[PDB]
């Protein structure tokens, strides 16, 4: 059975207990912490591409009101985010299983942009998700996995200084 684990869940959970925030910029900002995934149970010899996307966890706009995040009352449907291809893709199962798959080069933006960067809506909550796509073979297959521990709200600047302090402490 294909197994997907989050690396450094210890640390993600500290961020999650505070409500995590990720900066978005017009040019695109890399994530901290970085999503790193442990994968076992692939065919060492089969070909796979890793995809990362961000699910809108709810349909609301969030605001930091008197030291607390609180959702708006006017939900709107959220169009799905674009997919980021891990730059090691396509690659053999052995490649993906020899070390945690690290999405260190994805950039989060608030503006529709050339290529690479993934556009999110500021003040929406997101749940990172990967797709593992078996390619080249006769039988295409997709395995998907969400990471609730890695949920964050997209922000143009940090609101909760406890997040700011954790970000620096651990970078
Ligand atoms: C890098 N790459 C893939 O891994 C393809 C299997 C996909 C569809 C996810 C690719 C290459 C050119 C154009 N699109 C996607």
Q: Which long-range contacts (CB under 8 A, 24 or more apart) does 135-144 make?
A: 135/47, 135/48, 135/49, 135/90, 136/46, 136/47, 136/90, 137/46, 137/47, 143/2, 143/4
* Cis-peptide, bond into residue 33, ω within 30° of zero: yes
DSSP helix/strand/coil, 7:
coil
C-alpha dist (Å) from residue 89 to 62, 69, 97, 133:
35, 37, 13, 10
Measured distance CA(168)–CA(171) in Å, rounded: 5
Structural contact between residues 151 and 127, judged by C-beta atoms closer than 8 angstroms: yes
Q: Identify the domain containing residue 85 by its residue range.
A: 1-171
How close is the Cα of 156 to the center of ligand 1, in Å? 30
Of 46, 47, 48, 49, the one to substitute when testing ligand 1's pocket (max ligand atoms within 8 A of C-beta) is 49
Q: Does the CB atom of residue 85 touch ligand 1 within 6 A?
A: yes
Q: Which two tokens stand for residue 97?
A: 């299983």
C-alpha dist (Å) from residue 116 to 22, 29, 66, 168:
17, 11, 36, 26
Measured distance CA(50)–CA(89) in Å, rounded: 6
C-alpha dist (Å) from residue 149 to 19, 33, 103, 146:
10, 11, 16, 9
Sheet-wide strand order for 107-109: 29-30, 107-109, 118-119
CATH number at residue 2: 2.60.40.820
Measured distance CA(85)–CA(82) in Å, rounded: 10
Domains contained in the chain, number: 1
Enter the resolution in angstroms. Answer: 1.6
How close is the Cα of 132 to the center of ligand 1, in Å? 12
Instruction: Write phi, then psi, for 93 (nearest 5 degrees).
Output: -45, -45
Give me the helices (H) in 30-171, please: 93-97, 161-170
How close is the Cα of 30 to the center of ligand 1, in Å? 22
């Amino acid at each position: 059975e294909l197994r997907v684990g989050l690396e450094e869940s210890e640390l993600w959970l500290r961020f999650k207990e505070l409500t995590n925030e990720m900066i978005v910029t017009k040019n695109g900002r890399r994530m901290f912490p970085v999503l790193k995934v442990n994968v076992s149970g692939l065919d060492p010899n089969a070909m796979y591409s890793f995809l990362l996307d961000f699910v809108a966890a709810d349909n609301h706009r969030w605001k930091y009101v008197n030291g607390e995040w609180v959702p708006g009352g006017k939900p709107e449907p959220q169009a799905p985010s674009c997919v980021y291809i891990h730059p090691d893709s396509p690659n053999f199962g052995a490649h993906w299983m020899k070390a945690p798959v690290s999405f260190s080069k994805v950039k989060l933006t608030n503006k529709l942009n050339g290529g690479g960067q993934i556009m999110l809506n500021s003040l929406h909550k997101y749940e990172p998700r990967i797709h593992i796509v078996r390619v080249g073979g006769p039988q295409r297959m997709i395995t998907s996995h969400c990471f609730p521990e890695t949920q964050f709200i997209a922000v143009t600047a940090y609101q909760n200084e406890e997040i700011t302090a954790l970000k620096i402490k651990y970078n």
